[PDB]
Design a protein around this ligand. Structure first.
Ligand SMILES: Nc1ncnc2c1ncn2[C@@H]1O[C@H](COP(=O)(O)OP(=O)(O)O)[C@@H](O)[C@H]1O
Ligand SMILES: [Mg+2]
Length: 252
């Protein structure tokens, strides 16, 4: 249910402390409010790869505000899945790049052997919030929301959450913050790190047991870049800096 160090090693993946914390969490609602360059995309892609191989027949989506944004995590899952399939002889990968559809077929024997029968198919799709029409179906075991704070809450409440609750699927909800909107609320439901600047009501907030939240500024992950980030404030508006790098929740 959780990818292991052995699985990371297969992926050529060496997570950072914040990525590792996300991977170790068993919460069905993981909410990561992290600045740019925090490793959000890579960690989410690793989660998807693991599900497709470790849970044959699993179905998941990555949803972003736009298709170009969804292509980022989707494309990384593709590379990893097509490479990793080499060491699982009973799998065969099928890709539809145009439709952002990735299939991992699981067989009853190695694919190169006579008589191989397909037993299960894991499926991973990219989806766009700015195309609600293509949000139909589907029984999901997992979902990734990328730049979630820019996705309308209605996409979550109406088009994603109902299908997840069916199979008791999990959600990884990741974003740089965009003020005090639904992403802030979901973040607080899982925030147990106490009072922290940039997070209103931290320290006094309630939490829900199925929620776990993660927070990191860009310079928490890249301390050697802290001075460069700070020196950009000469030409970057203060709000943009506090949100995109500080990962701060600010009342617009
Ligand atoms: N554990 C890691 N080790 C090395 N590089 C990483 C790791 N995680 C992320 N990256 C790098 O950062 C990018 C992936 O996530 P990214 O988009 O930077 O983080 P965020 O989504 O938080 O902005 C890629 O450039 C990837 O090479
Ligand atoms: Mg990202």
């Amino acid at each position: 249910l959780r990818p292991s160090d052995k699985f990371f090693e297969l992926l050529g993946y060496k997570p950072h402390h914040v990525q590792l914390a996300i991977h170790r969490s068993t919460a069905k609602r993981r909410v990561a409010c992290l600045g740019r360059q925090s490793g959000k995309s890579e960690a989410a892609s690793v989660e998807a790869v693991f599900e497709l191989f470790a849970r044959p027949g699993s179905q998941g989506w990555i949803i972003a505000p736009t298709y170009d944004q969804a292509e980022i995590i989707f494309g990384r899952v593709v590379e990893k899945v097509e490479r990793l399939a080499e060491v699982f002889p009973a799998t065969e990968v099928q890709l539809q790049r145009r439709r952002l559809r990735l299939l991992v077929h699981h067989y009853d024997r190695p694919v190169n052997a006579p008589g191989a029968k397909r037993v299960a198919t894991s499926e991973f799709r990219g989806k766009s919030a700015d195309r609600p029409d293509n949000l139909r179906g589907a029984t999901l075991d997992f979902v990734i929301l990328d730049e979630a704070a820019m996705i309308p809450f209605s996409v979550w409440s109406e088009a994603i959450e109902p299908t997840l609750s069916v199979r008791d699927g999990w959600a990884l909800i990741i974003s740089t913050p965009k003020g005090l909107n639904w992403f802030y609320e979901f973040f607080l439901m899982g925030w147990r790190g106490g009072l922290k600047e940039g997070i209103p009501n931290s320290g006094i907030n309630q939490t829900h047991p199925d929620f776990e939240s993660f927070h990191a500024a860009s310079w928490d992950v890249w301390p050697e870049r802290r001075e460069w980030y700070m020196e950009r404030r000469l030409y970057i508006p203060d709000l943009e800096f506090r949100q995109e790098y500080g990962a701060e929740f600010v009342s617009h």
